[PDB]
UniProtKB/Swiss-Prot annotation, chain A:
HAMAP family: Rota_VP6, Rota_VP6_A. Intermediate capsid protein that self assembles to form an icosahedral capsid with a T=13 symmetry, which consists of 230 trimers of VP6, with channels at each of its five-fold vertices. This capsid constitutes the middle concentric layer of the viral mature particle. The innermost VP2 capsid and the intermediate VP6 capsid remain intact following cell entry to protect the dsRNA from degradation and to prevent unfavorable antiviral responses in the host cell during all the replication cycle of the virus. It is found in: Virion. It comes from the Viruses. Ca(2+) binds at residues 266, 286. This is Intermediate capsid protein VP6. Keywords: Calcium, Capsid protein, Intermediate capsid protein, Metal-binding, Ubl conjugation, Virion, Zinc. The N-terminus is blocked. Sumoylated with SUMO1 and SUMO2. Sumoylation of viral proteins seems to have a positive role on viral replication. Gene3D superfamilies: 2.60.120.170, Viral capsid alpha domain.
Length: 396, 49
């Protein structure tokens, strides 16, 4: 991995720094590293495999070194370097794709493709130089059992889930009490509905709880909390739990009462926010507990009092909401996020070569299935393929 | 003035390079290049630069 990354980084530096007219002293160390890579790779035969529709490709390395002959680089030097760099970049991209399309149940973090297994030999270790990118840095630290994290903007931590719970229900679905929620990506939009508007509640208070267990621990998370859930504030015709029939939802939005967001780690109260909205910070957590109350307004204007009668039928259903958005976080494990392209890159490579479903990942690299059952083996394989994808992104 | 066992063609080039190296108005980059510029002898290819 470090050798493959070092090849990619050397090639990127060569493409960016070996430019016409540049001082010889701008590239001396780069030329030395590039010649070291050429020497190490010369005389070695590589094969990128024929898994799926990925074509089998054979790579031979017999390239002359780069000289150091002009004070300012000229077009001839750049052209020779470009020829060598193009061949090497093609080889590295093919190696990255081959590694990306494989997986293993037992040693998911270890190399899978023959080319990357060969590049893990001692003879190629000389190619290894600066490992500065976030993913390679995390890879190297993780190999040493050191604490490190990936920073995600809008981490895709919640598997898609749009469902409801009815705590009070009837066959006619006309006096319902329960909760709706959408947990999608970095967003949790929850709502608690009472059709009776807590007319018969002990203190005209109906308590609602939503507990979301994160599949991985998130640290240093910045979170936006908003009182209302816009997704559950318009009339809906909703299938029953079995799908036998459909019931009617006609929300009227009330201010959430006694709102408490608890971010829990190991069952301990790490962070607590009571009636606080806007931007909040969750230090380090793996569970979110949103508890909110629907309180019947003690004093109502005649129209509001007309909305909520003392008994059935109930045509306007009182709803309290909550929206939680993880704008950024840090996770010890790799995750899909809104800014990076690693999941997109791996999925595109797997789809474009018709890679058969393996024993580790879900079909089509479906992210909801992947995060739903985010096992340690899947974590290892995903980290491997994401690191390879980030290596490939430096050139392709 | 080569720091890597450098050679030049021909002796007149050596005289010119020494004079430029010792000159005080020479650019530091030019001086460092004179000290670092190298020949390349590829005996397997039967080529010399
Ligand atoms: Cl955004
Ligand atoms: Zn953004
Ligand atoms: Zn139902």
């Amino acid at each position: 991995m470090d050798v493959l990354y070092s090849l990619s980084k050397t090639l990127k530096d060569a493409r960016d720094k070996i430019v016409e007219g540049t001082l010889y002293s701008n590239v001396s160390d780069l030329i030395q590293q590039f010649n070291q890579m050429i020497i190490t790779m010369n005389g070695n035969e590589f094969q990128t495999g024929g898994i799926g529709n990925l074509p089998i490709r054979n790579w031979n390395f017999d390239f002359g070194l780069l000289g150091t002959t002009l004070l300012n680089l000229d077009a001839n030097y750049v052209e020779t370097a470009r020829n060598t760099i193009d061949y090497f970049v093609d080889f590295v991209d093919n190696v990255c794709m081959d590694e990306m399309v494989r997986e293993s149940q037992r040693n998911g973090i270890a190399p899978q493709s023959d080319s990357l297994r060969k590049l893990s030999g001692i003879k190629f270790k000389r190619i290894n130089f600066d490992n500065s990118s976030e993913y390679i840095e995390n890879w190297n630290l993780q190999n040493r059992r050191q604490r490190t994290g990936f920073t995600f903007h809008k981490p895709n931590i919640f598997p898609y889930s749009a469902s409801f719970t009815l705590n009070r229900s009837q066959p006619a679905h006309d006096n319902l009490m329960g909760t709706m929620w959408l947990n999608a990506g970095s967003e949790i939009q929850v709502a608690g509905f009472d059709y009776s508007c807590a007319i018969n509640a002990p203190a005209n208070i109906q308590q609602f709880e939503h507990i979301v267990q994160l599949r991985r621990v998130l640290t240093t998370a910045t979170i936006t909390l908003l009182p209302d859930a816009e997704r559950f504030s318009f009339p809906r015709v909703i299938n029953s739990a079995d799908g036998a029939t459909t019931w009617y939802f006609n929300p009227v939005i009330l201010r959430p009462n006694n709102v408490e967001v608890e971010f829990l780690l190991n069952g301990q109260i790490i962070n607590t926010y009571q009636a606080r909205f806007g931007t909040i910070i969750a230090r380090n957590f793996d569970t979110i507990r949103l508890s909110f109350q629907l309180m019947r307004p003690p004093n109502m204007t005649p129209a509001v009092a007309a909305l909520f009668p003392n008994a059935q039928p109930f045509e306007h259903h009182a709803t309290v909401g909550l929206t939680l958005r993880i704008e950024s976080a840090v996770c010890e494990s790799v995750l899909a996020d809104a800014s990076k392209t690693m999941l997109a890159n791996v999925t595109s490579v797997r789809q474009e070569y018709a890679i058969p479903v393996g024993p580790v990942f879900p079909p089509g690299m479906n992210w909801t299935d992947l995060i739903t059952n985010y096992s340690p083996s899947r974590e290892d394989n995903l980290q491997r393929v994401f690191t390879v994808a980030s290596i490939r992104s430096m050139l392709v | 003035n080569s720091r890597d066992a450098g050679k030049v063609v021909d002796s007149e080039t050596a005289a010119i390079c020494d004079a430029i190296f010792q000159d005080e108005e020479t650019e530091g980059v030019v001086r460092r290049f004179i000290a670092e510029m190298r020949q390349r002898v590829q005996a397997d290819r039967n080529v010399v630069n």
